[PDB]
């Protein structure tokens, strides 16, 4: 059973990899000139922030560009009709079978 830990860790691995790719690209572009290099300007926090926020907001578990094979149905909006509804929503499983 993939709970919040495994789900968010799998999601975060890709975003950290993308952040490393972007800082690498920026460093190479700024270093081929040979002038200098900076760290803060090389890091795009928007990647991690927007990626986590989007995946939690829509439920399509993956990157926005590839929301075709992304498995939808994770991260539903909490049911608040009754306390029993809230509890039974918070303790719920799912079989990805079609």
């Amino acid at each position: 059973l993939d709970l919040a830990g495994p789900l968010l860790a799998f999601l975060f691995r890709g975003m950290f990899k993308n952040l490393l790719k972007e800082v690498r690209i920026y460093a190479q572009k700024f270093i081929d000139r040979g002038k200098d290099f900076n760290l803060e300007l090389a890091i795009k926090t928007r990647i991690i922030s927007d990626g986590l926020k989007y995946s939690l907001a829509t439920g399509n578990w993956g990157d926005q560009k590839k929301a075709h094979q992304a498995r939808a149905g994770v991260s539903q909006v909490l049911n608040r009709l009754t306390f029993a509804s809230t509890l039974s929503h918070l303790r719920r499983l799912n079989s990805p079978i079609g």
Binding site: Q64, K65, K66, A67, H68
Partner: protein
């Protein structure tokens, strides 16, 4: 393609452009052929 065929091309730009126009027209007719680029416009959503 009209401009290229007027000003003269390199005998392969014309062929590539012909293939590209063929792809665009074919996808306009039907966008579900097996083994095609599957043209999109924005946000990754395929056309209709």
């Amino acid at each position: 393609l009209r401009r290229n065929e007027q000003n003269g091309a390199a005998a392969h730009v014309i062929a590539e452009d012909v293939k590209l126009l063929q792809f665009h027209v074919a996808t306009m007719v039907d966008n579900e052929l097996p083994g095609l680029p599957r043209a999109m416009q924005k946000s990754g959503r395929p056309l209709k």
